[PDB]
Amino acid sequence: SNADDYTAGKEYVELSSPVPVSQPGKIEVVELFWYGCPHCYAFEPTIVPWSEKLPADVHFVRLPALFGGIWNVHGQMFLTLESMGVEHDVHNAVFEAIHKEHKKLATPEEMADFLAGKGVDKEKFLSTYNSFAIKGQMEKAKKLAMAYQVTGVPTMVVNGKYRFDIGSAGGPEETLKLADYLIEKERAAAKK
């Protein structure tokens, strides 16, 4: 796709105060999501393989949407699992537990007992979940979402500058095409 396909402010929004990227020198791509959001679950098998194919000049990051209440609890679980280094199938187990099994996963005790049956070490989970370090990460993730001015999920942000989502892009594949377009826009601008 190209500029002809989009209207700035519609399919994507440009931030007036670009947010510094996590990895200088690479084009950042962030997905913000909540485990409990049905469209986040539906988007997972679309965004994940795409992210695996990203080139060396792109740096892909995921953040929990810490939008309050159970979103924060689930987000803390996400940060915990990421820190532990789990494989992606564990994330699918969490999604499935919430969306298909209707499990609440509302406390670390419940999470650890559930995840223990999904190949996640309970003691490492509880230690990580309850760590001072994870509190720091949570505060940073809250501040980032505020800086990105995110209102919903799943949301994409390219290079700390352009925010878009599935609705704004017009569908799951459209979201990836828009991401590719904005990534290329940033890539080209840096080559001038």
User: Among candidates 15, 7, 9, which has minimal Cα distance to 157?
Assistant: 15
Burial (CB count <10 Å: 0-12, 13-18, 19+), residue 8: exposed
Tell me how many domains the chain contains. 1
Residue reference for tokens 């796709």 = 1
Cα 12 to Cα 18, 57, 162, distances in angstroms: 14, 22, 6
User: Among candidates 131, 148, 179, which has minimal Cα distance to 63?
Assistant: 148
Question: In terms of DSSP bridges, do strands 27-33 and 58-64 run parallel, antiparallel, or are they unpaired?
Answer: parallel
Domain ranges, residue 145: 1-192
Separation CA 79–CA 138 (nearest Å): 8
Residue 102 CA neighbour count, 13 Å, CB half: 0
Q: SS3 of 158, please?
A: strand
User: Among candidates 67, 68, 79, 65, which has minimal Cα distance to 135?
Assistant: 79
CB atoms within 10 A of CB 68: 8
Q: SS3 of 179, please?
A: helix
Residue reference for tokens 């187990």 = 93
CATH of the domain at 183: 3.40.30.10
Report the chain's C-alpha Rg in angstroms. Answer: 17
Give, as one character, the DSSP assignment of residue 6.
Answer: -
E strands, 77-149, in order: none
